[PDB]
Amino acid sequence: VNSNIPTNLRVLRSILENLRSKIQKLESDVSAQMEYCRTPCTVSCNIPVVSGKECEEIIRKGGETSEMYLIQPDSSVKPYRVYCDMNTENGGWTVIQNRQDGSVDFGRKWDPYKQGFGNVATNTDGKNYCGLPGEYWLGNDKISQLTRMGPTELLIEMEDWKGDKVKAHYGGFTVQNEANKYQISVNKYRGTAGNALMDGASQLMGENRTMTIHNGMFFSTYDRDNDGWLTSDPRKQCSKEDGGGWWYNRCHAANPNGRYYWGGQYTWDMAKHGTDDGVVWMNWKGSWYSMRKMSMKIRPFFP
């Protein structure tokens, strides 16, 4: 007539037995991964003979296949590697960012974001050249220098876990240099994903909407707050919380450099800091949906 079924509520221990068992699975999983990392992956990227300033010039020179090429945008600089998409919308696209399998971590600092990191391309099944792009970030300096040679368009493509795909085309894209913190500028929107960079999230109203705009923002990384979130709590940064280096505002409507959730749908209780830190494009699928693929491509425009 007192402690009724209290015995009964030991559906805890049920729990806690688990957690204790789960923590052991997780310790071997990290330990097996750590033993696999005693040996690195390797690729063998034979270099296409044709070269040019950038993928546009290479396609004009006969380079019809999509693969890794070496470009030299400018003689000051040393030729470097890039993946060239020669099939989409007429080809000539230089891939600047590519997500498709989670094989590369995007939570990096200012430096790696400045130099570029990840895998440009990998060896196709039995072929002696690297025909498949990997996950990479070309490098803000290099993105900058590509966008300031001349008018450059931006093509953003993404695909969901069910096979649907959409795109956001920006006929003007420019990224200033390191002194200007790689500030971004995009215009002349078009496509089917919505205009996340220019207009912020369509799910939001008034000033919430406006604080998710990217256009005009500076680049942030978790060791370098440049966000548009005036605040004094250091934990309270956009990039420490939504995970990539990006042109965050307060914080985003698009987060292409975010975390790759397997399968797409994720929840606040799965995220490191409880925010929408997936590979997100609010305007098409909200904040709790992570893309299976996302890429950023560029190409000189016309004048």
């Binding site: 999230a201 998710t212 914080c251 985003h252």
Partner: peptide, 4 residues
């Protein structure tokens, strides 16, 4: 998202 935004931050209020």
């Amino acid at each position: 998202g935004h931050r209020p």
